[PDB]
Design a protein around this motif. Structure first.
Motif, mmCIF file in Angstrom:
data_model
loop_
_atom_site.group_PDB
_atom_site.id
_atom_site.type_symbol
_atom_site.label_atom_id
_atom_site.label_comp_id
_atom_site.label_asym_id
_atom_site.label_seq_id
_atom_site.Cartn_x
_atom_site.Cartn_y
_atom_site.Cartn_z
ATOM 1 N N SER A 650 0.831 -1.196 0.000
ATOM 2 C CA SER A 650 0.000 0.000 0.000
ATOM 3 C C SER A 650 0.869 1.250 0.000
ATOM 4 O O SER A 650 1.922 1.296 0.641
ATOM 5 N N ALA A 651 0.419 2.276 -0.729
ATOM 6 C CA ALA A 651 1.179 3.517 -0.821
ATOM 7 C C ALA A 651 0.291 4.753 -0.741
ATOM 8 O O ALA A 651 0.690 5.818 -1.227
ATOM 9 N N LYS A 652 -0.900 4.642 -0.146
ATOM 10 C CA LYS A 652 -1.798 5.791 -0.058
ATOM 11 C C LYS A 652 -1.161 6.923 0.738
ATOM 12 O O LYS A 652 -1.131 8.076 0.287
ATOM 13 N N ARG A 653 -0.639 6.613 1.926
ATOM 14 C CA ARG A 653 0.057 7.628 2.710
ATOM 15 C C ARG A 653 1.326 8.103 2.017
ATOM 16 O O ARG A 653 1.727 9.261 2.186
ATOM 17 N N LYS A 656 -0.050 10.525 -0.874
ATOM 18 C CA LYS A 656 -0.985 11.567 -0.464
ATOM 19 C C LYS A 656 -0.366 12.493 0.575
ATOM 20 O O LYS A 656 -0.384 13.718 0.417
ATOM 21 N N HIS A 657 0.191 11.925 1.644
ATOM 22 C CA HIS A 657 0.777 12.712 2.718
ATOM 23 C C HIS A 657 2.293 12.606 2.789
ATOM 24 O O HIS A 657 2.905 13.285 3.621
ATOM 25 N N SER A 662 5.288 1.989 3.725
ATOM 26 C CA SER A 662 4.371 1.111 3.015
ATOM 27 C C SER A 662 3.640 0.242 4.028
ATOM 28 O O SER A 662 4.069 0.099 5.175
ATOM 29 N N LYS A 741 -1.117 3.189 -11.470
ATOM 30 C CA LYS A 741 -1.353 4.565 -11.055
ATOM 31 C C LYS A 741 -2.730 5.083 -11.447
ATOM 32 O O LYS A 741 -3.157 6.113 -10.915
ATOM 33 N N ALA A 744 -5.295 2.813 -8.454
ATOM 34 C CA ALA A 744 -4.932 2.442 -7.092
ATOM 35 C C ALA A 744 -3.667 3.179 -6.674
ATOM 36 O O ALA A 744 -2.966 3.777 -7.495
ATOM 37 N N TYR A 745 -3.390 3.125 -5.374
ATOM 38 C CA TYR A 745 -2.158 3.635 -4.776
ATOM 39 C C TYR A 745 -1.341 2.416 -4.352
ATOM 40 O O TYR A 745 -1.510 1.889 -3.250
ATOM 41 N N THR A 746 -0.453 1.965 -5.235
ATOM 42 C CA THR A 746 0.304 0.741 -5.022
ATOM 43 C C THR A 746 1.776 0.989 -5.316
ATOM 44 O O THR A 746 2.117 1.648 -6.304
#
Length: 884
Positions: A650-653, A656-657, A662, A741, A744-746
């Motif tokens: 996972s790479a949302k944080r 995004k922030h 990960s 991309k 998803a945020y991967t």
RNA sequence: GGUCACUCUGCUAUUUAACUUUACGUUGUAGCUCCCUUUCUCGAAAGAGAACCGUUGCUACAAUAAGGCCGGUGCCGCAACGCUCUGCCCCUAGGGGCAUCGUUU
DNA sequence: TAACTGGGCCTGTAAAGTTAAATAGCAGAGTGACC
DNA sequence: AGGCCCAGTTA
């Protein structure tokens, strides 16, 4: 330019080497001249021992599988639109179905009793197409013994048998009553095969559903829709098509441009028969005797009449009982099988124009043609395309119904047609070959050149040995192109270099023993040395390969004499074999190491002039200026290919922030205390009680996660009663690769660093600071050039370009303001600190013989050139090369 | 006669190269579901109740190299080899080396 | 507060088929080169 | 093995 060379080369799995020597009038060497050793990149995955191209083939296969599955589902959705099941308002911008139900198993079960919504119906069809079970796709013939049925076959057959019983009508109904019974889930998990179904049962469910939804007034039960869905479910691309078999065939022995004859040919089967018969000169009455012509003619044509002409039938046809004969076979097991003719006969007797007891007949050329067709092609399309208007349509249909040929023989149909009548007469195979092709039958046309050319495309099986032979040809040509043609070079393949990684791990002459190397060297250009007696010639010794190849080389240069003669004599069933000569028993130990001299602790003679002068003052006229202190030559790797790591995180944080972490779920069976400390719901304080319970369960078993959290023996339960099989864990992710991309945020770890570009800068306090930038394969694929140096800040115009390099490229060493020169070899680089792994002229066992060095303040690091055995020049580059 | 090697046949063991599929696994998004941080709303209190985010389990769907091509249900893309076309590096018009060049495709 | 350094963790996997080729062992037939 | 982070130490 006077020249003379009998130098000698010794090769291994991870190294080759050579040492030159000056010879005299006849088979006697004077003092040595020059030496040099090359090392290897073992052509296999180090730990597993798998082939490097094997992972590439698997990647290609999974690419094709994923792409074809995606396109099959796309075709399914297009068909759903065309047949009026769904309308354009039901598809989103990406072509997917809006509000598609997520209960296809329950819907597949309920379709047996009620009507289905077009959305429910489309979901059921797409679920059946996506998950379609396994297809047998193997030869339909069998026996009464299936012992090697593995996990997949066991599960499939058990589910099929449980579906054939009168309780569950369809696979979905069985899946719902196994979901509730003991599994708790429907599909397979953790690499299991208990829940998979046969594609025949799924096809049956599809047909039965279509019939049921015809009963209940589903408006979309069209024949076109049914045919399309069944085709999408059943159709697979063929495994063999076109010249697939033809491209894999070997080459005929005598006939140059002719393909091999199929083993199931009439000519080839008669050839096997006649070989067996004429080479059956085996009748032991105390002495062997051949078969007379009348005996052969009487026994020859029985295998066509009966099914299998076994040895008992052969004896019962003609012989007696006292001169037992039947050579070196020590019961009677079938002795010959006319499998092609007999198989065609029984196949035509199954349905076609044929009688059981009556003997069948066809043009022998037509039998040849159909055998070749069924061996070279497997699809009905190609077989008909080759045999249409060569055979009649009905017999062709029967043959396609029940015929399959696999194997081949070593000789073409043309040479076979020329040879087999001579064997029908009674002549042997070698007799016919000598009569037809003039006992030569193959012309080496030994175009002996100074340089050695490389090997052809179909060189040999083992890629490790293929690379060994290629680099051996390279190292031999490098010395032959500058020291003249050698008289009796050297030959040396270790017992481990030959083959058998698995046996090599067991050890930590059953091998591909130079069958392509001996032939190549003997034809296109020598002394055949034996590593067992290659340690022998009078002269352990630092097993770590600083010059471990040099001794093997100098002694492969000395194996041409009575030593080998009575070595062969000892192989036939001798005590002494010393060859002391030239008084270099300790001079070679002085030269090959550089500073050995029996001292074992002394400063290396790392200078040419110093080395020659010092050896001149050591144990006189043997000094030759054509020598330099020896050091190993590294085969460099400059390939820009590679791949990122397969684990997706996972790479949302992360995007995004922009926190460098990960998140990935970790099974409780492979979990450790540090993973619990990095739990998502722990480090942010969401679930403290769950964390404490997991920590207690781990500490109770002292870290044995496979035993603390074990299914069916020690399951873990959350507060409330929900099972916990894995927990999301956070990991530090400083650098990564963004994937998928669009939706998803991967992220995935970088992997496969291809090169390193090092810049150098001044202007802090009058000192030199080096900044090192890595370049990975994914960056080359995306056509980007990084500007951040592993910990450092951006690369501006102020930093002057200095150089760039790949693995195994040598560079120069400072280590300080005032220290030695220390030429070394790059191995790795650190993405965090910018450190370097290195190895010098010592073999460099990556486990222990490593060297670590950081690079920010080294005051000199320089590009180098380290070509053949010892030809080191300084290379300099000033134009920063880009990537495409 | 022995030793080694070679051609052919049969059987066995191992290895390699190519292709066709299935079932997982990983990430994301949904839906139901286990916990639980925080913020609010109604409450005079007690107590309720919502919401984002996190997240346990199950189901489904998407992605499963990154990316190159080009005269659609298209061919490649984690390998090896080589100097016929190019670049780089190197060494003396000639020759090597390594490829981001070419071949197996 | 930024480098250096020794230690040490994580890394994609299994199953079912159609083929071709290479090495080795045994049995049968022969050849050639050495001892 | 390749990639590269972690905790301690050091300038």
């Amino acid at each position: 330019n006077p020249i003379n060379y009998i130098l000698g080369l010794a090769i291994g799995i991870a190294s080759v080497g050579w040492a030159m020597v000056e010879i005299d009038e006849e088979e006697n060497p004077i003092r040595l001249i020059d030496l040099g050793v090359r090392v290897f990149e073992r052509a296999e995955v180090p730990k597993t021992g798998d082939s490097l191209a094997m992972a590439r083939r698997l990647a290609r296969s999974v690419r094709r599988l994923t792409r074809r599955r995606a396109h099959r589902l796309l075709r399914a959705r297009r068909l759903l639109k065309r047949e009026g099941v769904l309308q354009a308002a039901d598809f989103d911008e990406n072509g997917l179905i809006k509000s598609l139900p997520n209960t296809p198993w329950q819907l597949r079960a309920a379709a047996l009793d009620r009507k289905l919504t077009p959305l429910e119906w489309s979901a059921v069809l797409l679920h059946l197409i996506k998950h379609r079970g396994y297809l047998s796709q193997r030869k339909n013939e069998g026996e009464t013994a299936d012992k090697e049925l593995g996990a997949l076959l066991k599960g499939v057959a058990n589910n099929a048998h449980a579906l054939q019983t009168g309780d569950f009508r369809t696979p979905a109904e069985l899946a719902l009553n196994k979901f509730e019974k003991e599994s708790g889930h429907i599909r397979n998990q953790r690499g299991d095969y208990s829940h998979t179904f046969s594609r025949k049962d799924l096809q049956a469910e599809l047909i039965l559903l279509f019939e049921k939804q015809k009963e209940f007034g589903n408006p979309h039960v069209s024949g076109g829709l049914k045919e399309g869905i069944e085709t999408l479910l059943m159709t697979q691309r063929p495994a063999l098509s076109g010249d697939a078999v033809q491209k894999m065939l070997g080459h005929c022995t005598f006939e140059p441009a002719e393909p091999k004859a199929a083993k199931n040919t009439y000519t080839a089967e008669r050839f096997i028969w006649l070989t067996k018969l004429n080479n059956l000169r085996i009748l032991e009455q105390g002495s062997e005797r051949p078969l007379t012509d009348t005996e052969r003619a009487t026994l020859m044509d029985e295998p066509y009449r009966k099914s299998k002409l076994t040895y008992a039938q052969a004896r019962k046809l003609l012989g007696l009982e006292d001169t037992a004969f039947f050579k070196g076979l020590r019961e009677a097991s079938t002795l010959m099988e006319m499998k092609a003719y007999h198989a065609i006969s029984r196949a035509l007797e199954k349905e076609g124009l044929k009688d059981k007891k009556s003997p069948l007949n066809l043009s022998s050329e037509l039998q040849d043609e159909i055998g070749t067709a069924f061996s070279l092609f497997k699809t009905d399309e190609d077989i008909t395309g080759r045999l249409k208007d060569r055979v009649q349509p009905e017999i062709l249909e029967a043959l396609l119904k029940h015929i399959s040929f696999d194997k081949f023989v070593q000789i073409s149909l043309k040479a076979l047609r020329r040879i087999v009548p001579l064997m029908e007469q009674g002549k042997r195979y070698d007799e016919a070959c000598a009569e037809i092709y003039g006992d030569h039958y193959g012309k080496k046309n030994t175009e002996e050149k100074i340089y050695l050319p490389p090997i052809p495309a179909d060189e040999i099986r083992n890629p490790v040995v293929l690379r060994a032979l290629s680099q051996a040809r390279k190292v031999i040509n490098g010395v032959v192109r500058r020291y003249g043609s050698p008289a009796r070079i050297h030959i040396e393949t270790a017992r481990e270099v030959g083959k058998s990684f698995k046996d090599r791990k067991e050890i930590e002459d059953t091998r591909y023993v130079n069958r392509f190397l001996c032939q190549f060297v003997a034809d296109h250009i020598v002394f055949a040395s034996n590593g067992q007696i290659t340690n022998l010639l009078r002269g352990k010794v630092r097993a770590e390969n600083d010059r471990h190849h040099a001794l093997d080389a100098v002694v492969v240069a000395c194996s041409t004499v009575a030593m080998q003669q009575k070595i062969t004599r000892f192989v036939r069933y001798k005590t002494h074999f010393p060859q002391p000569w030239e008084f270099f028993a300790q001079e070679v130990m002085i030269r090959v190491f550089g500073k050995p001299d029996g001292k074992p602790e002394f400063e290396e003679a790392d200078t040419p002039e110093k080395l020659r002068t010092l050896l001149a003052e050591k144990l006189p006229e043997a000094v030759h200026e054509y020598v330099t202190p020896l050091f190993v030559s590294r085969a460099p790797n400059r390939k820009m290919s590679g791949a990122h790591k397969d684990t997706l995180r996972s790479a949302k944080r992360f995007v995004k922030h922009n926190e460098k972490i990960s998140v990935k779920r970790v099974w409780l069976t492979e979990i450790k205390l540090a993973d619990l400390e990095n739990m998502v719901n722990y480090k942010n304080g969401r679930e403290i009680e769950l964390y404490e319970a997991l920590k207690a369960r781990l500490e109770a078993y002292g870290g044995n996660a496979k035993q603390a959290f074990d299914p069916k023996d020690n399951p873990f339960y959350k507060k409330g009663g929900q099972l916990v099989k894995a927990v999301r864990v956070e990991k530090t992710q400083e650098s990564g690769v963004l994937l998928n991309k669009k939706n998803a945020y991967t992220i995935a770890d970088n992997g496969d660093m291809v090169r390193v570009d090092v810049f150098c800068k001044v202007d802090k306090k009058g000192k030199n600071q080096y900044f090192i930038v890595p370049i990975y394969a994914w960056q080359v694929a995306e056509n980007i050039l990084p500007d951040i140096d592993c910990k450092g800040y951006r690369i501006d115009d102020s930093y002057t370009f200095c150089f760039s390099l790949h693995k195994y490229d040598l560079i120069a060493f400072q280590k300080d303001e005032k220290s030695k020169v220390e030429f070394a070899y790059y191995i790795n680089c650190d993405s965090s600190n910018g450190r370097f792994y290195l190895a010098w002229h010592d073999k460099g066992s990556k486990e222990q013989q490593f060297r670590i060095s950081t690079q920010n303040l080294v005051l000199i690091q320089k590009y180098q050139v380290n070509e053949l055995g010892k030809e080191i020049r300084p290379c300099r580059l000033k134009k920063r090369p880009p990537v495409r």
